[PDB]
Amino acid sequence: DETYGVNVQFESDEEEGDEDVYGEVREECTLSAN
Amino acid sequence: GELDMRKIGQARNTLMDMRLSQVSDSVSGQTVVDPKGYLTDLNSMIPGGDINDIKKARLLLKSVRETNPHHPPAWIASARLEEVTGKLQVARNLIMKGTEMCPKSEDVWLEAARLQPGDTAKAVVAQAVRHLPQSVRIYIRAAELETDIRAKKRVLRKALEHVPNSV
Amino acid sequence: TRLYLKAEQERQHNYLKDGPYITAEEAVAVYTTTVHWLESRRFSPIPFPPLSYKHDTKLLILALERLKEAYSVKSRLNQSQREELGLIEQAYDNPHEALSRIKRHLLTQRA
Amino acid sequence: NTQELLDLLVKCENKIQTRIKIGLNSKMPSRFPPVVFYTPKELGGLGMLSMGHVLI
Amino acid sequence: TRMGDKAQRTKPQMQEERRAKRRKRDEDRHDINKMKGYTLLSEGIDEM
Amino acid sequence: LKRQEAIAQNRRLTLEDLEDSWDRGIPRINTLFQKDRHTLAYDKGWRVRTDFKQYQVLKQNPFWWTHQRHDGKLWNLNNYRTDMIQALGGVEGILEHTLFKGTYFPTWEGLFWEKASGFEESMKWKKLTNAQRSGLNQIPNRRFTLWWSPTINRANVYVGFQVQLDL
Amino acid sequence: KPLPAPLDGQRKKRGGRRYRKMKERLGLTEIRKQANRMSFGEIEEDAYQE
Amino acid sequence: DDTNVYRVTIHKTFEGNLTTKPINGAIFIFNPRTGQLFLKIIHTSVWAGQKRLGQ
């Protein structure tokens, strides 16, 4: 579809408490003498 | 005559440095990065434009994606904004999120095939054919990302079996 | 503080006058021992940061964060403090340009 | 184990309480209640965390 | 006096919202995980 | 062991698992699940940089041992706060010595205290002299005294110096 | 090194597109909420988070 | 109800980029209690190049 004209929503969302949002773990020569 | 206090200190420091360098000349693998080369090759990767304008464009693309998750023009704009500035992995993730949020979209599927490598673009074309079959653009993207003769022949045979009315 | 500064200035002047306290032979022996230790450990020297270091952005962000944490929210900040905060914000705005400037300062700014 | 450290902590708490009392009352308050000092900040108190044997 | 008296081990707050977000992420990616290893050219049960 | 067991089934270790252990854990309060774990772990030398920070900032930091965002919260004193609130006579008993009853606020849970907001900004958005700043900083002391005034204005707290307010 | 006289402003009569620009850019309006309330009934942060 | 105030082209150009042309927005003010309708239009120029965030 064309859909000419789309409104935007700019707000202060997204609050992360210094932790993974979901429970599931978010974790994922040499000096010498010649 | 007069006393040059710093003279003896400078002489001793020079002698010590010379002795150490003589000792340091016996080192095995001490590395050295030439400042001439590094400075000359520093501008070998120099330029996206304004950082504030790119940040405002990314914020507008995020607001359009939050206001319309099922808009493959908004997903394509977010993927283009993430690919033109930053890394391509975030652009591939945004294209995958737009393809998962807006199914049966050929433009979002083409953006996901262009933003991801070919090993992921083949799976993206397979997911696009499973979500929206009889697509000539998805079939052309699957046949072009085959890099083989027999694989492209099988892709053309599958496209002729799916949509035989494509010239 | 003034007395300590004067004493430190006098000590530095005497060190310049008396020259290096460490003798050449002792320094050479210490350097030889350190070289032997490094060779036994086979420690590959840490090269200059390449133009495309994999974790350059992460290290730069960590350094900027660790430097920003000192500037706690107070009643106000000095002009030098304000300039430092502005430079930190600019570095957080253009990591690539900030890293390029850091490399240029490291390779050139010897004074 | 460092009984000297416990005595020092008690003396420091007493000194801080005396300073707070002087800041509040001009004279010497005869046994000001610990509620003024040890009440949490949310309740309006000073929120003092002390390791003394201040029996309520 | 004990050594753990009044000592409480904090618990992870907002665990139900994180579990609901993980369940929503697992349910939203069911069709992608069901056909993750199925290709378009090297699969026999792809079209079916 | 739990991470290995989850990897055996090829699944992530959810926060539901071993949640209580959050407070525990090898690093003070286990915070592996914390945000930016991969980002912080790449930057080493936390202990030396924290100890050497004493010569870089003119503020003495009592937490020279470890960082909260690097090793984790090594203590949980919330139970101490609850015990201190209860052992003072509960919320009602604590407020009894205070002037909360005179405020006629029947909601011991809804009332909100303006932290450093009694005035507009206590003239902080201005360029007043040092004496005005000292007066503004000492203004909260008057409020704190007023809040706990009934517990402090008792004739059994100070010496007998009974003085009645005019009119 | 003189010292400024102990004098202050006379009166306020102007405001809006004449003095409001300075009070909106330099002395910009902060949140003024969710940062001054205390919630004397509950306890949001930890006991010693500070 | 001025949710639709934000307006932009968000139109995929043929190649190279997409047309990032903001549209002239507006606000909605209607009174069903009196059957009124007053529309205050927000020009795209006011919302473009002002060097500010969405707040």
Curated annotation (Swiss-Prot), chain A:
Disulfide-bond pairs as recorded: none
Annotated tissue distribution: Widely expressed.
What is this protein identified as?
A: U5 small nuclear ribonucleoprotein 200 kDa helicase
Q: Where in the cell is it found?
A: Nucleus
According to the record's subunit comment, the protein's assembly and interactions are: Component of a core complex containing at least PRPF8, SNRNP200, EFTUD2 and SNRNP40. Component of the U5 snRNP and U4/U6-U5 tri-snRNP complexes, building blocks of the spliceosome. Component of the U4/U6-U5 tri-snRNP complex composed of the U4, U6 and U5 snRNAs and at least PRPF3, PRPF4, PRPF6, PRPF8, PRPF31, SNRNP200, TXNL4A, SNRNP40, DDX23, CD2BP2, PPIH, SNU13, EFTUD2, SART1 and USP39. Component of precatalytic, catalytic and postcatalytic spliceosomal complexes. Component of the minor spliceosome, which splices U12-type introns.
**Which illness does the annotation name?**
Retinitis pigmentosa 33: A retinal dystrophy belonging to the group of pigmentary retinopathies. Retinitis pigmentosa is characterized by retinal pigment deposits visible on fundus examination and primary loss of rod photoreceptor cells followed by secondary loss of cone photoreceptors. Patients typically have night vision blindness and loss of midperipheral visual field. As their condition progresses, they lose their far peripheral visual field and eventually central vision as well.
**From-to range in the entire protein, with total length:** 196 to 243 of 2136
Family assignment? Belongs to the helicase family. SKI2 subfamily.
From Swiss-Prot, chain B:
Compartment(s): Nucleus, Nucleoplasm; Nucleus speckle
Q: Which modifications occur after translation, per UniProt?
A: Phosphorylated by PRP4K during spliceosome assembly.
Q: In which tissues is it expressed?
A: Widely expressed.
- Name positions with the PTM Phosphoserine: 44
HAT repeat ranges, renumbered to this chain: 147-167
- Which residues are annotated as modified residue Phosphothreonine in the UniProt record? 31, 40
Q: Describe its function.
A: Involved in pre-mRNA splicing as component of the U4/U6-U5 tri-snRNP complex, one of the building blocks of the spliceosome. Enhances dihydrotestosterone-induced transactivation activity of AR, as well as dexamethasone-induced transactivation activity of NR3C1, but does not affect estrogen-induced transactivation.
What interactions and quaternary structure are annotated?
Identified in the spliceosome B complex. Identified in the spliceosome C complex. Associates with the U5 snRNP particle. Component of the U4/U6-U5 tri-snRNP complex composed of the U4, U6 and U5 snRNAs and at least PRPF3, PRPF4, PRPF6, PRPF8, PRPF31, SNRNP200, TXNL4A, SNRNP40, DDX23, CD2BP2, PPIH, SNU13, EFTUD2, SART1 and USP39, LSm proteins LSm2-8 and Sm proteins. Interacts with ARAF. Interacts with AR and NR3C1, but not ESR1, independently of the presence of hormones. Interacts with USH1G.
Q: What is this protein called?
A: Pre-mRNA-processing factor 6
The organism named in the record is Homo sapiens
Q: Which residues of the full protein are shown?
A: 236 to 404 of 941
From Swiss-Prot, chain D:
User: Which top-level group of life is the source organism from?
Assistant: Eukaryota
Found, by tissue, as follows: Widely expressed.
Q: Where in the cell is it found?
A: Nucleus; Nucleus speckle
Q: Which disease is it linked to?
A: Retinitis pigmentosa 13: A retinal dystrophy belonging to the group of pigmentary retinopathies. Retinitis pigmentosa is characterized by retinal pigment deposits visible on fundus examination and primary loss of rod photoreceptor cells followed by secondary loss of cone photoreceptors. Patients typically have night vision blindness and loss of midperipheral visual field. As their condition progresses, they lose their far peripheral visual field and eventually central vision as well.
Task: Give the protein's biological function.
Answer: Plays a role in pre-mRNA splicing as core component of precatalytic, catalytic and postcatalytic spliceosomal complexes, both of the predominant U2-type spliceosome and the minor U12-type spliceosome. Functions as a scaffold that mediates the ordered assembly of spliceosomal proteins and snRNAs. Required for the assembly of the U4/U6-U5 tri-snRNP complex, a building block of the spliceosome. Functions as a scaffold that positions spliceosomal U2, U5 and U6 snRNAs at splice sites on pre-mRNA substrates, so that splicing can occur. Interacts with both the 5' and the 3' splice site.
Q: Give the protein's recorded name.
A: Pre-mRNA-processing-splicing factor 8
Q: Which organism is it from?
A: Homo sapiens (Human)
Read off the lineage from the record.
Eukaryota, Metazoa, Chordata, Craniata, Vertebrata
Curated annotation (Swiss-Prot), chain G:
The PTM entry states: Phosphorylated by PRP4K during spliceosome assembly.
What tissues harbor this protein? Ubiquitously expressed.
Superkingdom of origin organism: Eukaryota
Q: Where are the Phosphoserine residues found in this chain?
A: 39
Q: Where in the cell is it found?
A: Nucleus; Nucleus speckle; Nucleus, Cajal body
Disordered: annotated span = 1-17
Q: Motif Nuclear localization signal (NLS) — list its residue ranges.
A: 11-24
Family listed: Belongs to the PRP31 family.
How does the record describe its quaternary structure? Identified in the spliceosome B complex. Component of the U4/U6-U5 tri-snRNP complex composed of the U4, U6 and U5 snRNAs and at least PRPF3, PRPF4, PRPF6, PRPF8, PRPF31, SNRNP200, TXNL4A, SNRNP40, DDX23, CD2BP2, PPIH, SNU13, EFTUD2, SART1 and USP39. Interacts with a complex formed by SNU13 and U4 snRNA, but not with SNU13 or U4 snRNA alone. The complex formed by SNU13 and PRPF31 also binds U4atac snRNA, a characteristic component of specific, less abundant spliceosomal complexes. Interacts with PRPF6/U5 snRNP-associated 102 kDa protein.
The Swiss-Prot or TrEMBL note on domains reads: Interacts with the snRNP via the Nop domain.
Q: What does this protein do?
A: Involved in pre-mRNA splicing as component of the spliceosome. Required for the assembly of the U4/U5/U6 tri-snRNP complex, one of the building blocks of the spliceosome.
Q: In its UniProt entry, what is this protein called? A: U4/U6 small nuclear ribonucleoprotein Prp31
